[PDB]
Ligand code: HEM
Ligand SMILES: [C-]#N
């Protein structure tokens with residue numbers, strides 16, 4: 473946990489400083505409300521079991537931000553390859569992430585830091 477990490481003088485992860493697991497869960501849920509309501513992205517998830525996806529994304533996002541969560545899903549590149557996702561789509565998604573983190577009360581600078589962790593992933597997500 474955060475305490476035990478501080479006991480070992482490690483630095484505080486983004487995970488810990490946005491509020492940890494409960495925070496990830498709040499964010500991911502608002503995230504998907506947003507995406508699924510955007511007709512520019514909606515259809516990417518037409519054939520998707522969202523309940524499953526959401527459990528997966530909570531683990532992946534939590535781990536990406538330094539949390540102790542296991543990721544039990546598939547590799548990003550295998551998942552996203554073939555799905556015709558462009559940098560345009562990726563950016564729209566990142567915008568919904570940023571809005572969800574704003575809605576939850578996370579400081580702008582920290583949101584920018586989080587995008588700095590996620591953006592690189594575009595290499596694996598996008599078709600290009
Ligand atoms: C870099 C940001 C993103 C991350 C971290 C991410 C992460 C994930 C994860 C963890 C899964 C579940 C993998 C599994 O089932 O084992 C997933 C699947 C999926 N992602 Fe992403 N994703 C990102 C961006 C996007 C974008 C931009 C789109 C489309 C606009 C997208 C569309 C999808 C779809 C349709 C699936 C699941 C297909 C299905 O099984 O129904 N993702 N992604
Ligand atoms: C990908 N959600």
Ligand SMILES: [K+]
Nearest residue numbers: 550551553554
């Ligand atoms: K695929």
